[PDB]
Amino acid sequence: GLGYGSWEIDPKDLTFLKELGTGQFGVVKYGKWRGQYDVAIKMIKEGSMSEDEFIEEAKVMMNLSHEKLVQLYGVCTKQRPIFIITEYMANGCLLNYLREMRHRFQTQQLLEMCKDVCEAMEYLESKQFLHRDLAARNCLVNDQGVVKVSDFGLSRYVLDDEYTSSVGSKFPVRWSPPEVLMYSKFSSKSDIWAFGVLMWEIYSLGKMPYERFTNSETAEHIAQGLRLYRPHLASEKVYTIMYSCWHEKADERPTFKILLSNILDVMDEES
């Protein structure tokens, strides 16, 4: 209460239960808030984040709410490392989930995963909010198998310069359109391109895009107009959708609303 804004959680209300893994900002734990509510607790490693800028942005993120978006519940700011408190996603990151062959996915389940993400992205686009680093590694899966988009916008606060421009060794080259790699031109349409690569990741059961290429080679391939090709599990109609995200001209790429319509049509035709 006293001492806390609407965006601030009291860390004393947290009970820590299990480790969930380690990501861009360090370790993530599963816990409860006020004894009952499941939460994930991202513990932000010292020196990793532009914390004041992130905290100001968290106030904006508190107002993003969609069933296919991992919900931000608040932040613990008064602290050693600061915490980000979010919705708990018991089945972990999508990339790893796709790679577990025991699931024996049907293609209708793969298309549903694409739809889940596309709905979240259509919501973000309706708010004029870019993800800026969409990829399977940044999607999460709940106990019901629903995929949700996470960490939206957070790349803006990463202090490790290896991540933050193409000149960096950890930049998401394989998820970037030509205008990002050539000129650093980010837009809705760079999220669209990344979404198409994400559909490729889903239909490829978690393969690395351009698996036989380095990042440098990938950039040369794409900037010469060449592309990923059709995963074996994708129908022609699904392939057409992902491929439409990769138009050399950003303005000729679809919106998320259009992509959603196309996905629904294929779900109806393939059902």
Ligand SMILES: CCC(=O)N[C@H]1CCN(c2ncc(C(N)=O)c(N)n2)C1
């Ligand atoms: C493929 C990527 C990966 O290994 N990610 C690690 C670091 C972030 N992460 C995570 N983050 C949040 C939640 C959550 N909200 O429940 C969760 N289950 N797991 C697991």
